[PDB]
Symmetry: D2
């Protein structure tokens, strides 16, 4: 294998997993470091997004994956740094050839309006102008989002079970009731997406023997992160959710290494993990900054001509005549 | 003046404007081009954001301008590529030490549920879990968004007038009723933020003599085909009917006669920029910038200069203060004992 | 094909040429290394044409094993066209190149103005590197074998191996000695103009090139457009200008007054795939954090060796783990 | 103080030094890391280059220092990764408007053909064609290089002394006889540039109490095994015998007790830095930088500060027309009528 990972370029083994950090940073996205996002690709052809915070969509688009393959989204919690770029995935996939609705698994809160189902319904209402104007010229079928809201308090319970893939959830201690951690279990592998938490009694039990154990680390201190991973004994630990600059990262590393000796990644954007029977391998992805979307399906639409136009004649009557300025390139192009 | 703009390094004069392109790209995300965003700094100390598209918050933070100086946001329209980072300016700016509500100017639509007020209302309901948890430990008042929703059909009417600065709005032709252009007037200067439109009769008249005139300039149909794999049909219709083509922008800017025109809202790539430039140059001879992320204009009586910003990968960092940020004690914990009895 | 080229990720077909711009600039800056080109042919042959100051960092990010890039053609002896020869010589021979380098370069009007003089004194310049390295490593890969050809010769063959011809012809640039190259193989013709003011040779000997490279700024944009209209290439490439959001736009305008044909404004890591049916332009996306990929009397006096600091205490703990 | 260093933005104090890492890497080329190169700026206006490795000319250029202010160049040793870019400083510098010869200080070897004097003499012969054609249109005086070859064996002896600035040299153990470390002394400050060495008894004694102490720090035997597939045999050897290991570095800096230590000469990557850092910290507890390209140190009475430089992708002007650059008319053309007759 190449010492760096070029997205689009490597076949996945049937008993292989590929996990890509598409965001690793603090609440704000910064230029070096988008907010929390993960892409899981399974050797069976299944692909999931675990969190999709502010700024992460530029990193996801650089994987060259057709939108119709990235329709299942898991949210750890409803911080803007964990789902702020769902709207970019929603609208941009519905302009880049996604033909299915998006599917989102997210936790409930202590009440209706503290839950993922409420949050997504109001986000779609937020962008009603976008939805209603676009749906005049393009079948809206993909503009939907189907929310699978699970119980936040459930202790390591299944929330997903399709095609030999299980996601399970357990609670986190973070800001307010609702956040959770996920175990992804497939073909004898376990991948643990920590989300955000203060040190709790659930993660060390339910994460145990994970091939890849992701956990927040600054909330959870670097000495705790070390205590937690000592207990879990994962094949590989990943620390994330801190700034990657030349004056904390190194003492974070030290602080972990006080109680945890096992294989350890200090996650940065576009860091990549290959899980096979023999190894857990860490590389960097080298991906286009000047990204475009790549076709996959691009599988017709067939728009309804019954829907009312969102224009009035008052607006349409402002059209400028540009027939002259466009004539030459027009002619030449229609040839 | 240095040939590059280092944010926080240059004092802005009394008769001077600085504009930075914090986003210039598309609804398609890309590390090289955030979606549409413009920061304007005036010599009287007033600062404004016009559009705040998905990803732009990375470039806004690179400017070394504290969050409490960036509370006034103007939106041209309600596409994700123009207001998708509002949520991140809201939540991020709040933890970073803004002490006042966010002020958002935005158009109406043809009915309530097509307007900026409904849009911002539902966005705050969307992030209720975020807001209600934050409001436990920080003053909730910076958490508010005050919307100033103005009539989209209005022809060059003032929507804002305070401390010698005026914003005017006029309509655009884009996807449906609601979208607008802005002209910022201050101290003899006019700055025009075109937003998104097909070629229209209002922009050329109301933009006339602007020191800086920004307008959508589309990728050629060839470049649409080259990538989106289109037929010589829906690639063609885009440049004829729905967007402003490079030739259409040329014609509009010939009419405006600005000191300096800015083309934006295209992928600025090694194999796109040159045929877009030539499209404009067919019908417009005058001073032109092919925008990209972190291009900055300095506006003075003598000159409109174009430079690149050489900016840090800077985040705001949490503003834990005394201040106007003291929490309303009477708010309930958002924890139950079930969660809190889980600490290791 | 993928819309960006990822080096080491694409098999070259038997009737395909790949051409990568490893340097496009002036005398050496961060966006933009000095002139260099890598040509990969579908018969398995690889060449470097120019290796200017800074280019090696781009050549190393291609993930090409060192023993595959041992043939170098120099247009001329400006530092912006062979400054990183030494960095190929030393770093190739660290990276485990087992063969010496072969350098084709032109003569001058006299001995001390040609390539053989230049490379001989280059290796004498780095004698201390050479002589200390040769204590531990076999020095056979340290050699540079120079093929010096007549700078005067009008489109004469300088190289002829495995179905690949290089031809040289003269340039007009600083002084006698600079040349242009045509690479021919399997019906294809790739022209490396090097540096020059407009000359009568290039328009004649570049004619019908699959890819024609020419300096463009010495040669005006307008002049470049005049030349390429006469050359009528499948695809033209302008290079050796600064590519900041300013003068490139007018450079592009200048060319289009006289040349309408396919045209690339070369930047670092720009690559062209040449097939029967197309000449395609993509950008190469490659690692900034590159590594090598595999594919005598002592020079110490005892006075020096006597200065060794004992570091046993300090190195014991890591040592008792690593030995395990 | 801005949290990043913008070059050209910050007046240097009369009691202040700025040091910039213009290359931190290895003999394998890499866009992320040019070969060994250091720029040092004193508050008295004097500036020095210590090492000018292959590829470092890009980073020096980004500092917005004109070429006539960078004529003084000190080499630790004659490896490509410490003087490869001399020729680019030589020819680049001259065209750009250096008025005086290059001044180079470097060590002798055990014989003439192992010294800096021989190396530089043959470098100029190598680029005879460049020199002779340039010498037609510019005054040749800038194209000279005055070499100051000092005894490599001398123990902490002065090799340079002027304007209150002193450089001393002492030997290293690296490849064979000839390599050295420098100490720069000015205004009660000491900056040590270690060059390349295996652990030696001289550096600790002569570097003692440096304000900034730079020393080579090797990747782990672990890391050499992963990348280069070296056997446990030859891997352990590099970090035990020929190189300064991360642990060895920590032993030397614990002895030296600098105000601030700098590790360099290693690939600074997301899977190498952390285990290097950990090796130093086995034996050294004091202030430490793990060097990468465009890191900068400010030395004042109160602090040694580490920041990153946020610099533009700058190339030097290109001098044009001056009086000290006017061409020597006695010089012969290098064109023959055969080449001139080819003009179109
Ligand atoms: Zn959170
Ligand atoms: Zn978070
Ligand atoms: Zn729009
Ligand atoms: Zn838009
Ligand atoms: Zn030249
Ligand atoms: Zn060395
Ligand atoms: Zn070295």
């Amino acid at each position: 294998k190449r010492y760096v990972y070029y997205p689009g370029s490597e076949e996945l083994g049937p008993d292989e997993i590929r996990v890509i950090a598409c965001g690793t940073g603090m609440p704000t996205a910064r230029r070096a470091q988008a907010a929390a996002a993960w892409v899981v690709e399974l050797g069976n052809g299944d692909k999931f997004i675990v969190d999709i915070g502010s700024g992460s969509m530029a990193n996801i688009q650089s994987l060259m994956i057709p939108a119709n393959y990235l329709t299942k989204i898991f949210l750890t919690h409803l911080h803007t740094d964990h789902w702020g770029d769902l709207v970019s995935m929603w609208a941009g996939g519905w302009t880049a050839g996604r033909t299915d609705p998006l599917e989102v698994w997210g936790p409930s809160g202590s009440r209706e309006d503290m839950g993922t189902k409420y949050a997504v319904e109001h986000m779609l209402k937020a962008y009603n102008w976008d939805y209603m104007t676009r749906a005049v010229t393009i079948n809206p079928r993909p503009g939907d989002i189907n929310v699978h809201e699970f119980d936040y308090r459930a202790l390591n319970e299944v929330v997903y079970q399709e095609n030999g893939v299980t996601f399970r959830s357990w609670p986190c201690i973070h800001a307010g009731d609702g956040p959770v951690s996920f175990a992804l279990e497939w073909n004898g592998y376990k991948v643990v997406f920590g989300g955000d938490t203060a040190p709790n009694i659930w993660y060390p039990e339910y994460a145990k023997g994970a091939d890849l154990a992701i956990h927040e680390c600054w909330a959870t201190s670097a000495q705790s992160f070390g205590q937690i991973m000592n207990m879990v004994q994962p094949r590989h630990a990943v620390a994330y959710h801190f700034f990657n600059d030349d004056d904390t990262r190194y003492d974070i590393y030290t602080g972990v290494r006080e109680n945890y000796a096992g294989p350890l990644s200090m996650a940065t954007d576009m860091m990549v993990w290959n899980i096979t029977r023999d190894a857990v391998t860490e590389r960097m992805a080298v991906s286009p900054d000047h990204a475009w979307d790549v076709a996959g399906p691009s599988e017709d639409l067939a728009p309804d001509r019954n829907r009312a136009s969102e224009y009035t004649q008052y607006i349409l009557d402002g059209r400028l005549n540009v027939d002259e300025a466009n004539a030459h390139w027009k002619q030449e192009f229609m040839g």
